[PDB]
Design a protein around this ligand. Sequence first.
Ligand SMILES: [Mg+2]
Ligand SMILES: [Mg+2]
Ligand SMILES: [Mg+2]
Ligand SMILES: [Mg+2]
Lengths: 204, 222, 212, 232, 195, 195, 125, 196, 196, 226
Amino acid sequence: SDPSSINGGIVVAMTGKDCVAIACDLRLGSQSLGVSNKFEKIFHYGHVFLGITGLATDVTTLNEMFRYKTNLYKLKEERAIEPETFTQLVSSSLYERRFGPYFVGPVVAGINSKSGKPFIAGFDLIGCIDEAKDFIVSGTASDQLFGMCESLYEPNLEPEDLFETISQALLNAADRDALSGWGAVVYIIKKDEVVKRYLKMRQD
Amino acid sequence: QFNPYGDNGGTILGIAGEDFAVLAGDTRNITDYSINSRYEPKVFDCGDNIVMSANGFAADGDALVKRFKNSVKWYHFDHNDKKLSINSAARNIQHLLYGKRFFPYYVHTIIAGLDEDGKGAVYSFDPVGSYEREQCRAGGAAASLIMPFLDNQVNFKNQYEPGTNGKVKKPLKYLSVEEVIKLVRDSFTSATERHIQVGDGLEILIVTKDGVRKEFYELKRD
Amino acid sequence: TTTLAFRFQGGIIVAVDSRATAGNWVASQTVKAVIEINPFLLGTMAGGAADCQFWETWLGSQCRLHELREKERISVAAASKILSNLVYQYKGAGLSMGTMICGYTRKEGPTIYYVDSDGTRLKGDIFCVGSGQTFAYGVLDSNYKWDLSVEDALYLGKRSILAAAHRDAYSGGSVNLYHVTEDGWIYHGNHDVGELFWKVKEEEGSFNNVIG
Amino acid sequence: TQQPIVTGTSVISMKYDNGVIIAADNLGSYGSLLRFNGVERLIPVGDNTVVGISGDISDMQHIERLLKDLVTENAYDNPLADAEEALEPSYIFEYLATVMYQRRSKMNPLWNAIIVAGVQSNGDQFLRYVNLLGVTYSSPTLATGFGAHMANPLLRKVVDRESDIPKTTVQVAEEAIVNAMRVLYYRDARSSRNFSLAIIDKNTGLTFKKNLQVENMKWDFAKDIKGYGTQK
Amino acid sequence: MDIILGIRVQDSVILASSKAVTRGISVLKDSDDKTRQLSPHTLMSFAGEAGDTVQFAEYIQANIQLYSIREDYELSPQAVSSFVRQELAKSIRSRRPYQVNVLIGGYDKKKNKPELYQIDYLGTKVELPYGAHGYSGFYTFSLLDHHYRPDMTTEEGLDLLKLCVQELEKRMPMDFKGVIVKIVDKDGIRQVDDF
Amino acid sequence: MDIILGIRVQDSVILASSKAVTRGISVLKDSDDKTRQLSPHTLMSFAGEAGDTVQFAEYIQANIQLYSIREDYELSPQAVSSFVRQELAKSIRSRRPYQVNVLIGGYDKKKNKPELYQIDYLGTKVELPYGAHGYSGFYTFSLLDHHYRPDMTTEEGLDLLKLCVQELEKRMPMDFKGVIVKIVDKDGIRQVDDF
Amino acid sequence: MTDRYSFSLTTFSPSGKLGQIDYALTAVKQGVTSLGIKATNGVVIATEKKSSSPLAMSETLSKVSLLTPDIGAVYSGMGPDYRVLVDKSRKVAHTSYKRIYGEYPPTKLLVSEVAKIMQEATQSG
Amino acid sequence: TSIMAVTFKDGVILGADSRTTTGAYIANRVTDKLTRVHDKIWCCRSGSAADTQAIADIVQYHLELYTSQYGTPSTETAASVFKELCYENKDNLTAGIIVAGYDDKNKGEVYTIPLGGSVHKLPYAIAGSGSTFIYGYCDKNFRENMSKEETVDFIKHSLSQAIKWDGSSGGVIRMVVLTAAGVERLIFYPDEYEQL
Amino acid sequence: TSIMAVTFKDGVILGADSRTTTGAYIANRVTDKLTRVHDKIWCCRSGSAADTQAIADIVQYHLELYTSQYGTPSTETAASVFKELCYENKDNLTAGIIVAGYDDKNKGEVYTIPLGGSVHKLPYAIAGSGSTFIYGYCDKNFRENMSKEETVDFIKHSLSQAIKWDGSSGGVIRMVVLTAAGVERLIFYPDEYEQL
Amino acid sequence: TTIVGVKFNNGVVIAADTRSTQGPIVADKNCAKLHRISPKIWCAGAGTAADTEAVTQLIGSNIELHSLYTSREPRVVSALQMLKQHLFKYQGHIGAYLIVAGVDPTGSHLFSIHAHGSTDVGYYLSLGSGSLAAMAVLESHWKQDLTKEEAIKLASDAIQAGIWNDLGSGSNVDVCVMEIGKDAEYLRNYLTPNVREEKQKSYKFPRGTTAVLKESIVNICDIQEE
Ligand SMILES: [Mg+2]
Ligand SMILES: [Mg+2]
Ligand SMILES: [Mg+2]
Ligand SMILES: [Mg+2]
């Protein structure tokens, strides 16, 4: 009944030293029934990464919508969109459906190509921006993620250390949520290289 | 219409060591967005080297603890001052809770102590009496924030030995009382940051063969 | 929760998962869904944790009183009926129970009774109860035979719970196995689903949809 | 199950170095109607305890009778009724707390929020709260209803923790209480200007002050306020 | 509804759909074909609310046939499934939403690969080796999880499908009057007339 | 519920009762016997709410068996049916009523006549040549109205019963997993093991 | 009433000329000189304040206008046409950009929006 | 809320309390409920603060535009504009407005517009939650053609009682006097009116 | 209903209207709401007529039995018996009763027992649906130690206003005077009190 | 949320806490609730955070265009009129509760506005779940003719009351001071009385702790030449 918890799933993003990380589980379900273990919730438009949790049809729809808008942006601006700008676009796009909203929990992650500054941001389903320095969480195990991230996180972690921190935050949070899991992916993002790692986890 | 139940918030945590056990809980009592007390004890020494906490609706929690302490007293009267074992206390509490199956004590109960072999023991109850012996159990408002952390840092879940890449798990080495208290303090410090009902103070009761000891630590008051 | 029990040549196999949930929140991964009524009788836990624990523990007390008074092991028929008649008294009050009372006596042989909080009492060869019951039934129905060996029967029950643990969100944690003989039940260990899944995937070649 | 009819608003209280102070206005409201203007909601029990009650007044009058009966009953076959075996604040509270929880457990509550203020035999300050749900708690400051939201923040600036109690004099505590009552009169629509205040001190005993009024009020600044935005 | 199953094997996609149409008390028909050919190498089965199922399916069929004529070209299964998803995603926030769940089984002639897409009435699309809608998956997925291999032949796929249907006929309370089975491969779409 | 049919022929009463037991999503059993022998020449089939059906049937069985022992005498089918009716009539104005519908098929040894009684959970009793409970009558009564004769043999009764079951298997949405058929005559009660 | 001029008033002549645009350019030619120069660390735009009367306060007439905090505009030709274009340019910088991206448009894109408005007055009815 | 408007010999006086509540919380204890829609046409507002503010602002706009075209509007005209808004939007409004104004031709006039959007021209009017408690007092004590000082005393005493009994009323007593001489604002504090 | 009881120098006077309504229909226009529970202890009834009649009858019984054993009861004692019934049966009653009586020791006393079953001893009390409209008037006009004639005028004027504004009140004004001299019944008709 | 506005001698000050919550969970521990409508017109919002941001930026955008059109600096009464008419039109469905404060050529102003479109004038105001705690402090210490320094102190003290006593409020105190004839000074994290203590333990993992199935480079660059 509650649209934000029919399909399940989680996204988490973190900042480190000259890097950002964003990670998601791979589950898609119809309440109790697991349907897909390959439903990736992180997308990227150039060097800007967007994770989206919530109702899966809206996740897919919003990805297609932001691909649409970032493609036109690039043609007109003659440059790829930045994380700060994209964050405002997500906020604008969500609030224009204020009274018929997409049931989603978006998370933006990326590095400004000009300043080199790491950037993350979160939103509620109608566009309120949460621009945290440390971490952003979203999904059906958001409480669990808040608990993991709050205790495991420390500032200025190196890329390979940040990977371990965010991976463990996701994994153990997902293992305390019925509607999250069935695989996981972690993106480690630096100014001009991005690594994507699939994690091994329990499949129940 | 009259609602006989309320929510006084609070969060509690029980961890069983090899030859000890701890039962911790914050000292904050609330209703809605108000603070009733910054120091209202929630974990109690019930005698016979047993510690108890009934978290949730404080009136039901106080009633249950009061009745259990009374059960300990009468157990001595009726059975020649025999010490009430932690397993026997657990079964007794089940019956106290299930006695009100159709008008429950709106609490999550945890007891801690030592079993009859001197090993650490924690027992966890639902509001209507179902119970189980556990190694690690957080209860109350911030339980969802704490338990995943404990799975990771106590039971070393999802942690593997470097170089093997997932083939060899991190071995489950025994924790000292000092190591456990660190995890308890960090659990409540984190819970205080991210949960509005958690804060003010942390009171820990440690149980060994020597008896019951208390430790108190301040928490953020916002 | 997912629980099953089936009769076969070598007695009864009982297999359960270990997960407990409060909404989406996984409260426990280490719950005991098999209640050891006594050394000869087993009961499964589904629905209300407390209701099942409390009344099946109580059942053991009634079974013990029976054998003291009658100087004879209680039948599974009589033991199951004590429980079903009890919960039938409470019908409408809101008890939640779905259990299999499993035993092996001389007069009856291996026997399973499905007992339920709305008063149902069914004798049967195969039962599956819980949110993941349909997944377990699929593996059971296609592989069940009366002339299964104790080894193969134990694996079938384990594999059927695994099937449920995988697909059902509210089932998982670990698998507990029991084998009920005439001389009593025998525990066949706790099996973490996380480790079991990968082991079964490799050895069996199943779950090709999942990447490992 | 019932609904409160004639009601009393906030009861506020705090500890200080040598005792406790408790206060409550003299109003009995009938919904938005300020029906009864001479209602005493602080009820002394002996010379060491004062029970402050908010909520339903008919239930308050019942509790008042229970306490009166408690004093009578304690004196029966008790040669030390005015000495070692006199009623303590802790006895009076636990009794009320028992009754309140029993009544909520029968789904027929006494629709009240109660604060028992007093000084024990050994001179210790007693201050504990109980309500219609049987919920109990203690704190250096305690307040019911609106007082919980507006008085506590002010009173907690004086006594923020246990160690502030010995540093707080009776003059400072009374001053803080009286100011809080003024703030409640400004901001609580079911409050009155008239109130009662009681001090229970381990040295000077029980001082019960009736017919107090909120004074030194600020209203003059209202003359300059015009319209709701653009009006001049 | 009822029972729409799909399984993608080595060189084909197999769709199995129940034949029963029940209007409350009575079974009005026991030979209903719950499928439409969208293009020569793309088949869509469907289940959901009465009337809306056929209306939606025929509407999609008409649109894909229109595209085929305009461009003289068959859209890939992926392209068709995306079009169908958008239509359902559009439909949920409508005045009156189509309550239709579909499986799209197609053979991509460019990549020489069979493809199975599962889309529910919300517009939730997933590409799968095997899929279902409603309660069908609850009974059949444990069997498919066990026996499925990506290199299965069409005949092995049909045998695994028979085992799924047998389990459904055993444990489902509704009598769905068997299934019509259709195979989608490089040569197009054909019906298995004995099942 | 399910399907409990009764037909009274020349020299016997035949009761047909479905074998399925369904708990919501799954069919837990496909060999359930929804009947109790009250006395050597009296059989009662039943359908209704889970738990209450068997509890009521066994309670009636115990009472009739008690009467049989006390008096060393078998009560007539009419007497048994009246006792059962009163118990159900008593039950409706209870705190929690039994929701149980029954058919009582008996052979009266005094009158040498078969007798079929239909009693619903309200205590509504009727003696009939053929009867049913729930939706069973909706499908079967038109066939019974056409073919029934009071002088039918047991074999003809079984053939007419097969036609009724076939119509049920065709037009009913629920799969009731066939029926167990029992015959009550002068020699007592016996089960037809192939149907 | 109703605007019954739904047809183009600018059309191609046999020679391929769009007369009304050419004539608009002629009006610009008659207008007072304005210029712009780009430097390495800035841009300058300038024009003459051709006061119509010495009694007029030419400070109240702004020929050089702020469009965004980082964009300015000057013109040559018809002053009233410029004024309304500045109003439209300022608004379109918000409606088609700032309210979407939370920042002011780059120079080239704001120019593109102004250009679009001017193009439409060359084809619309 | 306790509001009233009273005609007297030299014109009309509007009176009001200053309490605005959100449940039992006093959100504003110094509210100005006497609002100006024209130089010598004011109103007293009761009901939804959002509604009565929105209405008053629209009326002020209408009378400003009226004045620019047709000169000073009558109090009757102002009441009609209020009524038109309240009546036509009765389903979506909760507004109880008293309109009071001074003409030189018509002198002091008072119109009350209750919930339905009806209009009633009266010698004096009372409204708001606190008015219920002073129907008896006001009926017994009102006289026509009172002096300024008598009318101020009448309003002060009346609202004093309304405030005394109504928890939704309180704070200061604001008054606005409308005569040929001009517009005079008055304020009376608790220490003054509570001892009456 | 409009009811009140007022203490004065020589004792106490109870006053009431005579209107009883079933919705908008006046079921009885000459009702007697002043009821006798003892020789010089009377009460005014408001709320459910069935409830207040049943209560008054039980109280009359209790005070009759009291008198037989312990002699004449006090007005306080009568109020307590009323309170006991109203408080203990608050869930099933809708009764608002004013108790008024004359002792020689205590003289005139008035107790009001509102819906909850609380007791409030007052110099005077008002109750019923019509009382709301005269809280202001009664507070401004009541004095302690009035004469019989002043108290009759005070009640007559007060209930006249309550009747004027409250549709649920009306008919005649009944009064009962309780003094050392005895018990006097008074009645005042519409033509008398409407012109006040 | 706790938000206050306080008038003083030559201007107005507005303050707020920095806790944003998702029910009982703290989403952001250092949220910025002090928003800018125009350079010298600032406001603070309680209620639905998306609504309070959207409505500020919309009116702020229209205020900027209005300022350019009229060649005048924006007025607080304009921001207020535009806000209330917008909010009233949406009948409370836009859950924006704001305290609006600022200086303009007319003088210094302080207003509150509620979601249904009602506005209020005052010398001191509070809003949000900690408004009662804050107002208790304001009613105890507010006086006429406050200095800039006294007003900043009173405002931050009122926010602290909310921080410590309201569970919906916490963390830090933000302040903005708008004085007549001066630039508005935004004082982000004016007070920081809730720094988290050092943890007992480091939770930095050994490298290689997490099990990995696959690694791959993600192509974020565009299609390359040659
Ligand atoms: Mg999981
Ligand atoms: Mg906290
Ligand atoms: Mg699972
Ligand atoms: Mg007042």
